[PDB]
Ligand binder design. Structure first.
Ligand code: GQX
Length: 126
């Protein structure tokens, strides 16, 4: 069994910015979700080999996780906040796509997503 390469966190020719919205995404949004008691299954890419989930990357073709997002934010990978918000939403959606309704992982994603929504509701103006 094999995992795919992880999503990139560095791309020197991709234009980048540091903006107040991106700073909020790191200092408020990421930090709030990262410390949560349910964050630990989303802090790195899904290891389909160790978890014995050979169908994970058959179904999930746009993987995303908070470890990747954290590195992207710390590395100033993004141009704008929408790119990062999209990454969080990809992470949550993948969980709902792969898993069964009511599974523990889905309840964990829902708890994190609730906080995500509350924080991005107050994304500062640029
Ligand atoms: C998003 C996600 N994370 C995990 C998981 C289990 S154990 C672990 N440990 C880490 N990452 N330290 N992550 C799963 C999952 C799914 O969607 C399907 C089932 C398993």
């Amino acid at each position: 069994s094999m995992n795919p390469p992880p999503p990139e966190t560095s791309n020197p020719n991709k234009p980048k910015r540091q903006t107040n919205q991106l700073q909020y995404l790191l200092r408020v949004v990421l930090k709030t979700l990262w410390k949560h008691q349910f964050a630990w299954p989303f802090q790195q890419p899904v290891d389909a080999v160790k978890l014995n989930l050979p169908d994970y990357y058959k179904i999930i073709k746009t993987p995303m996780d908070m470890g990747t997002i954290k590195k992207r934010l710390e590395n100033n990978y993004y141009w704008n906040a929408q790119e990062c918000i999209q990454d969080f939403n990809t992470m949550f959606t993948n969980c709902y796509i792969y898993n069964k309704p009511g599974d523990d992982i889905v309840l964990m994603a829902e708890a994190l997503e609730k906080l995500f929504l509350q924080k991005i509701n107050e994304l500062p103006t640029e």
